[PDB]
């Protein structure tokens, strides 16, 4: 899975 | 002053998850005396109901 | 301009805080406590308070 | 003349496998503005959808 440590504009990351 | 700080970690998913789920009957089988409804509560892993 | 704060399909209407919806027009449901207030708004207020 | 020849192996099972599968609804909730339908797409191992 993607870990996005961006303080602006992360990903939705619906996942399951 | 003193402020109670929230846990802010390992307490809530960033995953897109439904906060409130509606379950609608698979089967109804209405009769003159009662009104049956049959549901199917699917609780995935990581979900606690 | 695009980041909805719930933004995780949290509420039954993920894209807005539906405070009230007229029950006469209501078809899917999502109204709470025998009035036009919604499930999402009722949950939000009860959880906050 | 030259003829294109089929792979004649490793392209099709001998096992009896349905070529076209219909998934009828598990659970419907017919309402007056929409018509919800829910299915259980069961893809077995060795299958691909």
Q: DSSP for C7-26?
A: -SS-SSSTTS---B--TTT-
Residue D12 Cα, gap to closest chain B Cα (Å): 35
For C30, counting Cβ atoms within 10 Å of its Cβ (0-12 exposed, 13-18 middle, 19+ buried), the class is buried
| CB atoms near residue C41 (< 10 Å) | 20
DSSP-assigned letter for residue C36: S
Tell me the shortest Cα–Cα distance from A11 to chain B, in angstroms.
10
Instruction: Give the technique used to solve this structure.
Output: cryo-EM
CB C19 within 8 A of CB C36: no
Resolution in Å, one decimal place: 3.4
- CA–CA gap between residue D17 and residue B24 (Å, rounded): 33
DSSP C37: B
CA distance C33 to chain B (A): 16
Structure tokens at C37: 């207030």
Cβ neighbourhood burial of C40 (10 Å; 0-12, 13-18, 19+): buried
Enumerate the residues of chain A whose CB falls inside 8 A of the CB of residue B15: 13-16
Which residues in chain A touch residue B14, judged by CB atoms under 8 angstroms apart? 10, 13
- CA of B24: which chain C residue's CA is closest? C28
């Amino acid at each position: 899975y993607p870990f996005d440590p961006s303080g602006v504009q992360r990903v939705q990351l619906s996942g399951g | 002053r003193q402020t109670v700080v929230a846990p802010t970690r390992n307490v809530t998913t960033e995953k897109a998850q439904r906060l409130q789920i509606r379950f609608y009957p698979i089967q109804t089988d209405d009769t003159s005396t009662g009104y049956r409804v049959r549901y199917n509560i699917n609780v995935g892993d990581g979900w606690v109901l | 301009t695009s980041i909805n704060w719930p933004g995780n399909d949290r509420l039954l209407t993920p894209n807005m805080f539906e405070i009230k919806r007229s029950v006469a027009l209501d078809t899917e449901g999502f109204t709470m406590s025998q009035c036009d207030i919604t499930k999402d708004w009722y949950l939000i207020q009860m959880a906050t308070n």
